[PDB]
Enzyme design. Structure first.
Site, PDB file in Angstrom:
ATOM      1  N   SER A 152       0.859  -1.187   0.000  1.00 18.81           N
ATOM      2  CA  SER A 152       0.000   0.000   0.000  1.00 18.81           C
ATOM      3  C   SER A 152       0.907   1.254   0.000  1.00 18.81           C
ATOM      4  O   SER A 152       1.779   1.359  -0.869  1.00 18.81           O
ATOM      5  CB  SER A 152      -0.995  -0.071   1.166  1.00 18.81           C
ATOM      6  OG  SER A 152      -1.993   0.937   1.092  1.00 18.81           O
TER       7      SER A 152
ATOM      8  N   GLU B  97      -8.963  -4.998  -4.717  1.00 20.54           N
ATOM      9  CA  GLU B  97      -8.289  -3.932  -3.989  1.00 20.54           C
ATOM     10  C   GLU B  97      -9.239  -2.861  -3.423  1.00 20.54           C
ATOM     11  O   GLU B  97      -8.905  -2.192  -2.436  1.00 20.54           O
ATOM     12  CB  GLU B  97      -7.265  -3.238  -4.909  1.00 20.54           C
ATOM     13  CG  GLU B  97      -6.079  -4.090  -5.355  1.00 20.54           C
ATOM     14  CD  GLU B  97      -4.982  -4.205  -4.305  1.00 20.54           C
ATOM     15  OE1 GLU B  97      -5.229  -3.864  -3.131  1.00 20.54           O
ATOM     16  OE2 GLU B  97      -3.867  -4.645  -4.660  1.00 20.54           O
TER      17      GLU B  97
ATOM     18  N   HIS C  26      -7.545  -5.624  -0.114  1.00 22.19           N
ATOM     19  CA  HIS C  26      -6.352  -4.821   0.167  1.00 22.19           C
ATOM     20  C   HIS C  26      -5.713  -5.238   1.493  1.00 22.19           C
ATOM     21  O   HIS C  26      -6.317  -5.083   2.545  1.00 22.19           O
ATOM     22  CB  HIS C  26      -6.760  -3.340   0.249  1.00 22.19           C
ATOM     23  CG  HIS C  26      -5.648  -2.370  -0.003  1.00 22.19           C
ATOM     24  ND1 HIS C  26      -4.832  -2.445  -1.111  1.00 22.19           N
ATOM     25  CD2 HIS C  26      -5.261  -1.259   0.675  1.00 22.19           C
ATOM     26  CE1 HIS C  26      -3.972  -1.440  -1.090  1.00 22.19           C
ATOM     27  NE2 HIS C  26      -4.212  -0.703  -0.019  1.00 22.19           N
TER      28      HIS C  26
HETATM   29  O1  HBP Z   1      -5.059   3.380   3.023  1.00 18.21           O
HETATM   30  N1  HBP Z   1      -4.731   2.093   3.440  1.00 18.21           N
HETATM   31  C1  HBP Z   1      -5.279   1.653   4.488  1.00 18.21           C
HETATM   32  C2  HBP Z   1      -5.035   0.259   4.957  1.00 18.21           C
HETATM   33  C3  HBP Z   1      -3.978  -0.440   4.358  1.00 18.21           C
HETATM   34  C4  HBP Z   1      -3.728  -1.761   4.700  1.00 18.21           C
HETATM   35  C5  HBP Z   1      -4.555  -2.367   5.629  1.00 18.21           C
HETATM   36  C6  HBP Z   1      -5.606  -1.655   6.200  1.00 18.21           C
HETATM   37  N2  HBP Z   1      -5.852  -0.374   5.857  1.00 18.21           N
HETATM   38  C7  HBP Z   1      -7.000   0.286   6.524  1.00 18.21           C
HETATM   39  C8  HBP Z   1      -7.905   1.049   5.541  1.00 18.21           C
HETATM   40  C9  HBP Z   1      -9.335   0.554   5.412  1.00 18.21           C
HETATM   41  C10 HBP Z   1     -10.382   1.610   5.732  1.00 18.21           C
HETATM   42  C11 HBP Z   1     -10.250   2.944   5.007  1.00 18.21           C
HETATM   43  C12 HBP Z   1     -10.469   4.049   6.036  1.00 18.21           C
HETATM   44  C13 HBP Z   1     -10.321   5.439   5.445  1.00 18.21           C
HETATM   45  N3  HBP Z   1     -10.907   6.431   6.368  1.00 18.21           N
HETATM   46  C14 HBP Z   1     -10.205   6.739   7.467  1.00 18.21           C
HETATM   47  C15 HBP Z   1     -10.676   7.675   8.384  1.00 18.21           C
HETATM   48  C16 HBP Z   1     -11.894   8.307   8.182  1.00 18.21           C
HETATM   49  C17 HBP Z   1     -12.635   8.010   7.057  1.00 18.21           C
HETATM   50  C18 HBP Z   1     -12.158   7.069   6.143  1.00 18.21           C
HETATM   51  C19 HBP Z   1     -12.958   6.761   4.932  1.00 18.21           C
HETATM   52  N4  HBP Z   1     -14.049   7.340   4.684  1.00 18.21           N
HETATM   53  O2  HBP Z   1     -14.731   7.015   3.516  1.00 18.21           O
END
Ligand code: HBP
Ligand code: HBP
Ligand code: NAG
Ligand code: NAG
Ligand code: NAG
Ligand code: NAG
EC number: 3.1.1.7
Lengths: 532, 532
Positions: free
Chosen positions: B197, B324, B437
């Site tokens: 990522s 993804e 992902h």
């Molecule tokens: O960006 N990469 C993130 C990642 C990478 C490898 C494993 C796990 N993750 C957690 C991300 C999943 C959830 C996306 C959360 C995004 N988000 C964060 C804070 C507030 C709002 C949001 C999305 N809103 O639509």
């Protein structure tokens, strides 16, 4: 006498013709208008002065003056479309096939020839109305109209060459049928106009135009619709082409009156020789002199008429062929030829896209290329050939017909849609061209019933079945016989959008004919061209 | 003692850890930089002052300050990614797993965590380096770097918050490895940097940046590439977001010096609480504080660097997962949720397209919709769901990685590409999210070898096979063992573009990974957005 008929214009004498070891009457070469010669060139048609005595209607008339295909001399494939009579500007005649004994009031069908508004004849072997008339017991008319500059030279504002006069030629012939067909045993209340290519678009044009609507009952359209990108031009574009035509023949260009006079002094062939020089782009499936959006024949733009429901409301039967584009690529696109498989290189494919969508900017051309390219296998000569066949077919004929049919069905009283995909067993054109523009006509006119033409038995069966669909629809507004055990051609509806195949196999119903490509041509691409 | 190591910074004392009923050494929580606290917040990292005495390296360090997922409390699926240690701004540490007995000069792998540059920890269970180290006999390092505003607040021209300092954190850790890993038995000549990522994009960024190239030998990228649309911003956009952040916390905005000072007086959590308020669009897969194209770290734009060959030339191994996008739609797109099949209406599909391509005008949005809609079956809830999954995956991860790989291979010394599509048997997320992902990481780190985690035998076999690919590539520049009877992962070439699947079935080679969609994202759509 069965061969003598008294019309409102005077008496006509026909001839007895043999057909499938029976006989029928034929009234060939009846005039419906004053010869449009001299000062009447470029002008609206006048009705034919009645004659005393007996008009000899025993032989075909002249064909209108037109370009003559000479690409493959002696080759039937191309020459079956050429004029088989002497050409003349004195060509406004119609032909009638009448069952024997004379009917009283039966269904009438009037045929309108195609040929891109630049060509065509009522007198071709493939348009012989005797098999249809005989087999379905219908009165079959075939009309004629001026083509080329003679029919469609458009200087708007001038009453000497207004434009659209070839459409008014058709209208005057429908007027004559309305007025007189009863004397031949035709029912003027039950006239179906049908036509292929430019004739299909013509049919659609009479549906839209207020002046034409009252003169027919219902309509069939084969591989053509009024909204086709090649079937009409703005008044400005028509003016430009008429001026450029005059520029090609050294005319004085200071006034409409000067230009028109100059054009009227020229012999027919001088106009035909330079006709193709006026096109604005390097293109295929585009023709010089075509109907013009003038505000008289068409009150407003075709699209606004289709949206507001400004058209005749009645039944329509219509469809397309599988491989509408091949005829045009053969003649005009690099890499294609009659005697090879025409495998197309990537470079020739892109040259092809340019000629097929001549009005598109670079972004538009990319959009099209992306849509018809398999990027896994981009140098496959067959996939490039067929994709370009599909582009020309979809853009010119199928997606414009699908837009028309969807718009029409919203307001109409019944729609029946077909997809014709039988490759004829005796076809002289090469395999790669597939099911070609204009090769459903022979099945509609019953040529497979003639043994010496070498069709299979299942092709005879297909022809009969199509003739009976066509004729039963003309008679009733429905191609099916209610109460019979055969398979049902379903009604096309806004909701389910059903259609059938026409071929020798047991019928299949499908839905949404080439919708994935036609959303591209009818919605996305135009929006893309308006923004850029 | 096997657990005592003398480095250039001072002595370190590790701990013996059990693994698969054997043991190995672990040196956890070694500092590589001065704690970036107080006036050093937002600033470039300084090297760690050497210490006298023995640093206790027996326990994991703090995780950097970051947003904490609370959508599904107690749910392992989401919480496996959260910090499992106390958070602190004093977080610049690395961890080392060393085989027993101590090696002399063996291959080194240094892991760089993902988390959209807004989150991540080196200390997560799924990143435990002991299985990899033990099974392949490699020295496994895992580093850390500042995330969020702490790592990436960018006021260009100011030396107090230049931007990119989280990347320099990574660089300083690679510097430390370069300098010291020999004392742990690592070969500084044979370091592979790998990451998923944002960590994959980071790997790619060190390949491009002149300042980073000399500090590693080769590179692996998992589901990330430096040219991803979410992985960087212009200096102007970074400036804007830094200002808006200050506007959210009532800062004086008259000068850089005033803003930065104000931001430095705030407690960590005050910055985290308003972090998401600075995004310019309503979007998914977009993050507030990310690397900036500053002209120092990246000399010119990423695309011009990729075209001119301005990057480290060496081997690369890389790939993507099948699905993804699902993680992101779940969290942010209407119609999706964890405990249903998430069948999406046409209306929610279009809302989805808007959030997924936030920078696109109306024409662009139509172009995308057309490309991923089956017009035969446009109200199929599953096709709408999956199409939107594919849009988010293709745009964010797959097509940007494919552009990178094609550009890199022109100049590089060997490329190996994979497509990971095994759905784990014990996965806690719902069926519809597919191969998510971040869920190849567990196979890369060998968790399937631990019986109590409930994987199948063929999943153990897959994990071992991937570990040996990864480790053999780190050792030699080729994931295959020459001279062995197993199936050959072929080299990726400009010409044939070959790649493999990674899953429990016998391997298959294919070519041109999602080329039909990636020609759309990488060529057509950008051209469409530049013209309009
Ligand atoms: O960006 N990469 C993130 C990642 C990478 C490898 C494993 C796990 N993750 C957690 C991300 C999943 C959830 C996306 C959360 C995004 N988000 C964060 C804070 C507030 C709002 C949001 C999305 N809103 O639509
Ligand atoms: O437009 N419809 C024509 C038609 C309809 C039903 C049956 C047969 N045809 C003959 C058309 C095939 C050849 C197209 C010839 C076009 N063309 C004419 C003159 C000079 C040049 C060209 C094309 N150049 O690319
Ligand atoms: C004049 C007449 O009554 N009938 C004619 C016939 O004499 C002639 O052989 C034929 C060919 O033109 O056309 C018909
Ligand atoms: C100070 C030392 O030499 N070793 C320590 C040990 O005493 C302690 O139990 C453990 C937990 O913090 O960390 C290690
Ligand atoms: C056609 O019109 C008739 C009479 O107005 C009506 O009863 C019938 O439902 C219509 N058929 C279709 C298919 O719309
Ligand atoms: C990598 O570089 C070496 C040495 O310069 C060369 O011999 C070899 O062919 C290269 N391999 C590839 C795949 O380009």
């Amino acid at each position: 006498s069965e061969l003598l008929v008294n019309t409102k214009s005077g008496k006509v004498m026909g001839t007895r013709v043999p057909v499938l070891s029976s006989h029928i009457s034929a009234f060939l070469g009846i005039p419906f208008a004053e010869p449009p010669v001299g000062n009447m060139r470029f002008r609206r048609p006048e009705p034919k002065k009645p004659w005393s005595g007996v008009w000899n209607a025993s032989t075909y008339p002249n064909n209108c003056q037109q370009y003559v295909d000479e690409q493959f001399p002696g080759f039937s494939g191309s020459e079956m479309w050429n004029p088989n009579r002497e050409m003349s500007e004195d060509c406004l005649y119609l032909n009638i096939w009448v069952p024997s004994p004379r009917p009283k009031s039966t269904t009438v069908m009037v045929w309108i020839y195609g040929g891109g508004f630049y060509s065509g004849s009522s007198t071709l072997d493939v348009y012989n109305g005797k098999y249809l008339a005989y087999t379905e017991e219908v009165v079959l008319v075939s009309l004629s109209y001026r083509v080329g500059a003679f029919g469609f030279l458009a200087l708007h504002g001038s009453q000497e060459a207004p434009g659209n006069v070839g459409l008014l030629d058709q209208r005057m012939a429908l007027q004559w049928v309305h007025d007189n067909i009863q004397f031949f045993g035709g029912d003027p209340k039950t006239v179906t106009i049908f036509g292929e290519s430019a004739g299909g678009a013509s049919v659609g044009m009479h549906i839209l135009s207020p002046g034409s609507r009252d003169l027919f009952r219902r309509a069939i359209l084969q591989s053509g619709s009024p909204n086709c990108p090649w079937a009409s031009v703005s008044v400005a574009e028509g003016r430009r082409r008429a001026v450029e035509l005059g520029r090609n023949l050294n005319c004085n260009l200071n006034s409409d009156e000067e230009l028109i006079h100059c054009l009227r002094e020229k012999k027919p062939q001088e106009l035909i020789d330079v006709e193709w020089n006026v096109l604005p782009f390097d293109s295929i499936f585009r023709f010089s002199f075509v109907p013009v959006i003038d505000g008289e024949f068409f009150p407003t733009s075709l699209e606004s008429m289709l949206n507001s429901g400004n058209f005749k409301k009645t039944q329509i039967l219509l469809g397309v062929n599988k491989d509408e584009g091949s005829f045009f690529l053969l003649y005009g696109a690099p890499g294609f030829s009659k005697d090879s498989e025409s495998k197309i290189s990537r470079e020739d494919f892109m040259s092809g896209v340019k000629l097929s969508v001549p009005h598109a900017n670079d972004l538009g051309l990319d959009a099209v290329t992306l849509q018809y390219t398999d990027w896994m296998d981009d140098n496959n000569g067959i996939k490039n050939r067929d994709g370009l066949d599909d582009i020309v077919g979809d853009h010119n004929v199928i997606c414009p017909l699908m837009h028309f049919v969807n718009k029409y069905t919203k307001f109409g009283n019944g729609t029946y849609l077909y997809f014709f995909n039988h490759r004829a067993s005796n076809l002289v054109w090469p395999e790669w061209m597939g099911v070609i523009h204009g090769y459903e006509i022979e099945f509609v006119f019953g040529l497979p019933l003639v043994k010496e033409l070498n069709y299979t038995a299942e092709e005879e069966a297909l022809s009969r079945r199509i003739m009976h669909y066509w004729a039963t629809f003309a008679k009733t507004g429905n191609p099916n016989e209610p109460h019979s055990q055969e398979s049902k051609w379903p009604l096309f509806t806004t909701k389910e959008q059903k259609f059938i195949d026409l071929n020798t196999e047991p019928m299949k119903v499908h839905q949404r004919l080439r919708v994935q490509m036609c959303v591209f041509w009818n919605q996305f691409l135009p929006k893309l061209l308006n923004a850029t």
